[PDB]
Amino acid sequence: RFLKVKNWETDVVLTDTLHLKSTLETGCTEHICMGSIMLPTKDQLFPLAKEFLDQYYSSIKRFGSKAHMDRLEEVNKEIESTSTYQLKDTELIYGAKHAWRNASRCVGRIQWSKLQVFDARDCTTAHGMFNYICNHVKYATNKGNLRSAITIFPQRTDGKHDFRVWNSQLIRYAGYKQPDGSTLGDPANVQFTEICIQQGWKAPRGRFDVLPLLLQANGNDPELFQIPPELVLEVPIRHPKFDWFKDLGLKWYGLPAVSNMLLEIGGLEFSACPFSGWYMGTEIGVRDYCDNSRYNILEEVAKKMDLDMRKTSSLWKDQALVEINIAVLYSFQSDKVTIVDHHSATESFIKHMENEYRCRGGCPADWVWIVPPMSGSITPVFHQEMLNYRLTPSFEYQPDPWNTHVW
Amino acid sequence: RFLKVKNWETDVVLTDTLHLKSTLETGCTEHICMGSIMLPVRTKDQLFPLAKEFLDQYYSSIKRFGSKAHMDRLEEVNKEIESTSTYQLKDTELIYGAKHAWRNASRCVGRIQWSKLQVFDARDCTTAHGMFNYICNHVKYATNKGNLRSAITIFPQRTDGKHDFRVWNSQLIRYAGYKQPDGSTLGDPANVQFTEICIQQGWKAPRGRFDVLPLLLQANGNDPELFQIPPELVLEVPIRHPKFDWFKDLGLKWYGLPAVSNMLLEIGGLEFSACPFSGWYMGTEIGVRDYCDNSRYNILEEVAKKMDLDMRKTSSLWKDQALVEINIAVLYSFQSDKVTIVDHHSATESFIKHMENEYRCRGGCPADWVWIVPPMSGSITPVFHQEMLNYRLTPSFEYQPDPWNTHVWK
Ligand code: HEM
Ligand code: HEM
Ligand SMILES: C[C@H](O)[C@H](O)[C@H]1CNc2nc(N)[nH]c(=O)c2N1
Ligand SMILES: C[C@H](O)[C@H](O)[C@H]1CNc2nc(N)[nH]c(=O)c2N1
Ligand SMILES: C=CC/[NH+]=C(/N)NCCC[C@H](N)C(=O)O
Ligand SMILES: C=CC/[NH+]=C(/N)NCCC[C@H](N)C(=O)O
Ligand SMILES: [Zn+2]
Structure with missing residues (x-):
């Protein structure tokens, strides 16, 4: 199958073959497009694992090898007796860098490969989660010279021992709704800020108050922590x-630093995987x-x-x-x-996009999101046609924790 | 079936039930979205259902669904198609269709004015000169000394596809584009090709930066001709x-x-290859x-x-x-x-209003977000924060191949 994509400002046409490896649905049908809509088991797990592993080994140029097969069998057996499996470090890094590479809504994917991965899978407590997060914030901020990163906490098991970071981002200003009717600070966080106060946080009720982290580990009640002020640039x-x-x-x-999303690799789910860039x-x-x-x-x-x-x-x-x-x-x-x-940023994405077509045979992209909310048509991505589809590994949205936690 | 559309700036939610009457395809599958893609001789057995479909609509809109008038016409048309392989639309229906083709223009942010449209029946036209007259009257009525009025001139519906009427220019009024040996482009780059065809046809380009192009009109399937719009008519x-x-x-x-002039207007299965329309x-x-x-x-x-x-x-x-x-x-x-x-x-604020109205009265309002949102200050307009559902409804304005790439010269 071959799908064409034209840029009406340079007439350049690219062919997309990557969409063929599309798995999940889009929300769209032949009778209706939902492009502008914000958000439309053992036997299940093995195929997904296999799919992933094949991808990995194919990428390292060892498709079919004994190594490939061994792992293929090892995982199979493992899922057979444990109802899940653990990703070797190397596959985790790949898994992550690739969930990024597939983020059809990310305009800065040209940097997809330059990603620092922190394996936080051995974590077991909110305090532990806090140490990790602090380390991530520091490494990434790097005194003003930002570096991309992601810390990955224990993967889901039975869903009742889920690791979650209740903030939407590691760093955000608190939102306070006054009796006045108005709203002080960030309206977007009004609810969350309430849950922080309700949990004990003592709100300085300022316009730009750096909210506290509310970390949930192994499924237990979330705990509060204050990011070391000297770490918040x-x-x-x-x-x-x-x-x-x-x-x-x-x-x-x-x-x-987006922190409320869910990372999927080889069928595995990581409900807590804060990632940052710039x-x-x-x-x-x-x-x-x-x-x-x-x-x-x-x-x-x-x-x-x-x-x-x-x-x-x-x-x-x-x-x-x-x-x-x-x-x-x-x-x-x-x-x-x-x-x-x-x-x-947009110019960059165009080059990247051009590269992604020759090297990978495509680049899923959500136009509604790639085009900046200002001067749209004077950025090259405006005149660039794009095909949207979902590829795994992937970053997905997930229900707010407070709307699902069994206290 | 019910679909929910949310506006993230007001939290307003609307329910679409109109998409159910969607007919044609989008270009999208469950596996891929092509929302950002520019553009993803009918038989007699194909024609009737379409006509029936249309006529049912028309009558249902005047509150006469099922009436004798309704049925007779349904029978009249069926019979006509049966013996002529086509059928003429009554004046009242042509007006209904045109207004609705516009009403269904998913890429139009000005649809709030959909009903206030002046229709000019140019079906009795037969020659290029004839089209020329008609287009001049349209330009003049529409401009109105500066106070613009929406209007559309509809020429003979297609028949065997060999006697098609076409307006070669893309807009009735447009500046010429000229490519120089220098490599640069004088005037409007977007019209370079069309400008060439005009010169190649006899036009004598002034070779200026804002030269109003000549009309190239095709009637009854014959070779197009040239005409200069009366200067005093080009505001x-x-x-x-x-x-x-x-x-x-x-x-x-x-x-x-x-004034767009290269689209095709489909009403009750009938195709109108030349139907220039203008607004502001x-x-x-x-x-x-x-x-x-x-x-x-x-x-x-x-x-x-x-x-x-x-x-x-x-x-x-x-x-x-x-x-x-x-x-x-x-x-x-x-x-x-x-x-x-x-x-x-x-414009965008009005569209939001029009859009909400359309949901309450019609149960939807198909709209292309990629096109509705302005090319600047995107997020400071209400439509940016507005979710939209895109689907095709007829009557409709469609694209069609450029006539110079399809015409069988004589
Ligand atoms: C290098 C700097 C980066 C830049 C300049 C960049 C830029 C962007 C922009 C502009 C958005 C839209 C934000 C919004 O409107 O809410 C975005 C979204 C996204 N980016 Fe990137 N990005 C970068 C790094 C990253 C990293 C490191 C990852 C993954 C490891 C990534 C994953 C995503 C995801 C998941 C989304 C979509 C989030 C959503 O759906 O709300 N980005 N990025
Ligand atoms: C009252 C003035 C009107 C305004 C302000 C308005 C505005 C717009 C705008 C801004 C566009 C996009 C233009 C572009 O980017 O190329 C557009 C497209 C469209 N409008 Fe309107 N419109 C008006 C009248 C009309 C009329 C009278 C009709 C039909 C009778 C109509 C049918 C359409 C169609 C078919 C499209 C899409 C054309 C295409 O796909 O290239 N509009 N309109
Ligand atoms: C309704 C519409 O989907 C919504 O406003 C989208 C549009 N594009 C966007 N694009 C980016 N980058 N970020 C956003 O939050 C949005 N919001
Ligand atoms: C490639 C992309 O579809 C293209 O640039 C579209 C985007 N939105 C648009 N919107 C309007 N109104 N007009 C256009 O010509 C376009 N061009
Ligand atoms: C986590 C890295 C993603 N990079 C980003 N530039 N943005 C993510 C979303 C940030 C959000 N749009 C904001 O303004 O706060
Ligand atoms: C013909 C009426 C449609 N109303 C419009 N406002 N625009 C149609 C497209 C005109 C085109 N955008 C241009 O700049 O020349
Ligand atoms: Zn779509």
């Missing part, structure tokens, strides 16, 4: 020309700062810019939005903290 | 900035009437794509340079900065000349 936001900007009182954290400007300046549902800072910034906010046709929101992002990129670069803008 | 707008008095010196202007522009179309697309007028460098911004490193966002101003200029100029135009903020 933050950048104060200032404009390269608006000296009044700094008076906005804006700051953000430099380490983006930010693309717009993430903070466009979505976090300007989304109506977040810090919603357009009004202010505009006012302080003295623009005709009387009529929408003045594009005051557009003018402000560009300035707010200049500031973000400016700040980070000035404090020498890693960060990439939407122009570089 | 144009010179672009200038509300604060940059050096802007005007950029030498930019654009036509006020956006959303700023970003000109301001972002036509001016700033790399493969278009590519004016970012200039606007940036004259704005004197740091173009050394991308992280200074000079492009983002220049673009906004350029869009400011387009909206400004158009408002100054009292030429209808809408900004991406107003």
